[PDB]
Amino acid sequence: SLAALKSELQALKKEGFSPEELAALESELQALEKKLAALKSKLQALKG
Amino acid sequence: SLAALKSELQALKKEGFSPEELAALESELQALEKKLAALKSKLQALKG
Numbered sequence: 001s002l003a004a005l006k007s008e009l010q011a012l013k014k015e016g017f018s019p020e021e022l023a024a025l026e027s028e029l030q031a032l033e034k035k036l037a038a039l040k041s042k043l044q045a046l047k048g
Numbered sequence: 049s050l051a052a053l054k055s056e057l058q059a060l061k062k063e064g065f066s067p068e069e070l071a072a073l074e075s076e077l078q079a080l081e082k083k084l085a086a087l088k089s090k091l092q093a094l095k096g
Contacts, residue, residue, distance in 0.1 A: 002050050005088060018094050025094075028087055035080050036050055039073055043053070046066050046073075 002033055050084070053077060 009026055013019075057074050 002084060005084065005091070008091070012091075021094055025087055025091060028083075032050075032080055032083055032087075035076075035083075036053060039076055039080070040053055043056070043060075043073055046069050 005029055
Protein backbone atom coordinates (compact mmCIF):
# COMPACT_ATOMS: atom_id res chain seq x y z
CA SER A 1 0.00 0.00 0.00
CA LEU A 2 1.44 3.56 -0.18
CA ALA A 3 1.45 3.65 3.64
CA ALA A 4 3.24 0.32 3.81
CA LEU A 5 6.03 1.20 1.43
CA LYS A 6 6.37 4.55 3.18
CA SER A 7 7.00 2.74 6.51
CA GLU A 8 9.41 0.33 4.93
CA LEU A 9 11.43 3.22 3.42
CA GLN A 10 11.40 4.99 6.82
CA ALA A 11 12.69 1.79 8.45
CA LEU A 12 15.55 1.52 5.94
CA LYS A 13 16.46 5.21 6.37
CA LYS A 14 16.95 4.54 10.13
CA GLU A 15 19.57 2.03 9.03
CA GLY A 16 21.46 4.44 6.71
CA PHE A 17 20.58 2.24 3.68
CA SER A 18 21.62 3.57 0.16
CA PRO A 19 20.76 7.21 1.17
CA GLU A 20 20.80 8.85 -2.25
CA GLU A 21 18.82 6.11 -3.93
CA LEU A 22 16.34 5.96 -1.04
CA ALA A 23 15.83 9.70 -1.22
CA ALA A 24 14.83 9.23 -4.93
CA LEU A 25 12.39 6.45 -3.99
CA GLU A 26 10.86 8.57 -1.20
CA SER A 27 10.27 11.41 -3.60
CA GLU A 28 8.78 8.98 -6.17
CA LEU A 29 6.52 7.64 -3.37
CA GLN A 30 5.40 11.15 -2.41
CA ALA A 31 4.68 11.78 -6.14
CA LEU A 32 2.17 8.85 -5.94
CA GLU A 33 0.64 10.34 -2.76
CA LYS A 34 0.19 13.62 -4.66
CA LYS A 35 -1.20 11.77 -7.66
CA LEU A 36 -3.69 10.02 -5.34
CA ALA A 37 -4.80 13.38 -3.87
CA ALA A 38 -5.23 14.66 -7.49
CA LEU A 39 -7.47 11.71 -8.41
CA LYS A 40 -9.58 12.21 -5.29
CA SER A 41 -10.06 15.87 -6.28
CA LYS A 42 -10.93 14.89 -9.90
CA LEU A 43 -13.50 12.47 -8.53
CA GLN A 44 -14.98 15.24 -6.29
CA ALA A 45 -15.15 17.48 -9.35
CA LEU A 46 -17.11 14.70 -11.18
CA LYS A 47 -19.59 14.43 -8.33
CA GLY A 48 -20.06 18.20 -8.60
CA SER B 49 -5.91 6.17 1.01
CA LEU B 50 -5.29 4.34 -2.30
CA ALA B 51 -7.55 1.46 -0.98
CA ALA B 52 -10.33 3.90 -0.06
CA LEU B 53 -10.31 5.54 -3.48
CA LYS B 54 -9.96 2.21 -5.33
CA SER B 55 -12.99 0.84 -3.48
CA GLU B 56 -15.10 3.94 -4.11
CA LEU B 57 -14.23 3.95 -7.84
CA GLN B 58 -15.32 0.26 -8.05
CA ALA B 59 -18.58 0.98 -6.25
CA LEU B 60 -19.32 4.02 -8.48
CA LYS B 61 -18.69 1.73 -11.46
CA LYS B 62 -21.33 -0.70 -10.12
CA GLU B 63 -23.60 2.36 -9.70
CA GLY B 64 -23.08 3.45 -13.30
CA PHE B 65 -21.68 6.85 -12.25
CA SER B 66 -20.40 9.11 -15.19
CA PRO B 67 -18.91 6.16 -17.13
CA GLU B 68 -16.17 7.50 -19.36
CA GLU B 69 -14.99 10.05 -16.86
CA LEU B 70 -14.90 7.39 -14.15
CA ALA B 71 -13.14 4.85 -16.46
CA ALA B 72 -10.32 7.36 -16.94
CA LEU B 73 -9.99 7.64 -13.11
CA GLU B 74 -10.05 3.83 -12.76
CA SER B 75 -7.14 3.46 -15.23
CA GLU B 76 -5.14 6.31 -13.60
CA LEU B 77 -5.57 4.55 -10.28
CA GLN B 78 -4.35 1.32 -11.89
CA ALA B 79 -1.39 3.27 -13.31
CA LEU B 80 -0.60 4.46 -9.76
CA GLU B 81 -0.80 0.81 -8.50
CA LYS B 82 1.66 -0.24 -11.20
CA LYS B 83 4.01 2.62 -10.29
CA LEU B 84 3.77 1.56 -6.64
CA ALA B 85 4.71 -1.99 -7.63
CA ALA B 86 7.63 -0.67 -9.68
CA LEU B 87 8.91 1.24 -6.68
CA LYS B 88 8.76 -1.89 -4.53
CA SER B 89 10.68 -3.73 -7.20
CA LYS B 90 13.31 -0.95 -7.48
CA LEU B 91 13.70 -1.14 -3.67
CA GLN B 92 14.22 -4.89 -3.83
CA ALA B 93 16.82 -4.45 -6.65
CA LEU B 94 18.65 -1.93 -4.35
CA LYS B 95 18.80 -4.51 -1.55
CA GLY B 96 20.47 -7.05 -3.86
